[PDB]
Design a protein around this ligand. Sequence first.
Ligand SMILES: N[C@@H](CCC(=O)N[C@@H](CS)C(=O)NCC(=O)O)C(=O)O
Ligand SMILES: N[C@@H](CCC(=O)N[C@@H](CS)C(=O)NCC(=O)O)C(=O)O
Lengths: 209, 209
Amino acid sequence: PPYTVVYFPVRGRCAALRMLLADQGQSWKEEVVTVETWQEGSLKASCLYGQLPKFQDGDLTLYQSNTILRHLGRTLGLYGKDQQEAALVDMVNDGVEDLRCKYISLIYTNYEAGKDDYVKALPGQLKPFETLLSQNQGGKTFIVGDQISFANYNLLDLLLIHEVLAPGCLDAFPLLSAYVGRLSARPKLKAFLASPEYVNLPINGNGKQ
Amino acid sequence: PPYTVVYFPVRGRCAALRMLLADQGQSWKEEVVTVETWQEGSLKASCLYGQLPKFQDGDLTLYQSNTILRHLGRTLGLYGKDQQEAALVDMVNDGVEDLRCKYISLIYTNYEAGKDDYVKALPGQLKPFETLLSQNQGGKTFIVGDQISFANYNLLDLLLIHEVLAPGCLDAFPLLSAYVGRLSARPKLKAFLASPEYVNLPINGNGKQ
Ligand SMILES: N[C@@H](CCC(=O)N[C@@H](CS)C(=O)NCC(=O)O)C(=O)O
Ligand SMILES: N[C@@H](CCC(=O)N[C@@H](CS)C(=O)NCC(=O)O)C(=O)O
């Protein structure tokens, strides 16, 4: 630290890392970039991959939402108890990222025409995470092992936004349903999730959800 | 170990991890899955995300190509010299993954119609890695620090397959070019890249490259 997240005024790909920071009792600065400012072009040209989020941790500048999640997970000890759990943590997060990418595609490129098929395919897309839960302490703790690795925050966000896209999409999945309830009840996260800086931010940048 | 990769008969998403294993002098088994066997359905159903590669390391079963790369990077000490380089390694690999996803989209969903635009956009997609090179000992070593982190193998594969797609695409990028020549020359890796088990596999599964 100090931590600074530079991003558009949406939850988007900063939602998970924000929940992580808040739940772990960290402080940070929100640098809000408006689409107007973004169109000016100077900031974009300075971003390694021409995109946000941009993350500052002291004198370290990072890009890539999952790089930030892994960085935070690594430095705060939320990356598994050993090399094996760590790999499983990656496997979960890579799974979360795959589905987030299809979600983002639906939202921004084909929402009207594609929503039905997407919702049909959703159960098969969620089953893996229910299954991971079923294989770890009866799904009563976290996605991997008994500590709250960074992948949980990313998974939690993926689940929450899919409840908005397709209400009831977790009804057929007891472990995922209870998982979201439990994690969302953690004191600091609950408070964060209920705050204006979260609630009054749209999930995506195009008005759809 | 022992290491086993379960995959279709293509370079695809296993090319980089294979190069890594070969360059690092590791031994592994290839279990080839034909599309015929895949359509039978049983293996797919047993895969966490219904996809390959599947990776066996002793009694640990992993899925997700990048999870496998990070697993080998972590257990073989090819993941930066400290927490800070590790973050940069991730930032590189996430960038590689983003472009690989676009490459894969082109190949399998829009090759004929999309190629020309994609190749036009390619220079902008490659510059970031040239920029990273120029900020690390003049690009005379590796993509991050002076050790060959796993991310290097993924970047090398990405560059190699794009050279097939758009010959000369690295001519505008002296650092990337020299980087490719340099890594490709590494003895064990050089031998691998020229061996039948690499050369006689197509880059992709639909015969396009
Ligand atoms: N792989 C990147 C993707 C970043 C990304 O898609 N950023 C979008 C907003 S979520 C952006 O900056 N769009 C504006 C632009 O591309 O000019 C990550 O995970 O951070
Ligand atoms: N995110 C996964 C993607 C895996 C993937 O796309 N696998 C393809 C082959 S490259 C597959 O199994 N296709 C068959 C199917 O989906 O049934 C990774 O990086 O490993």
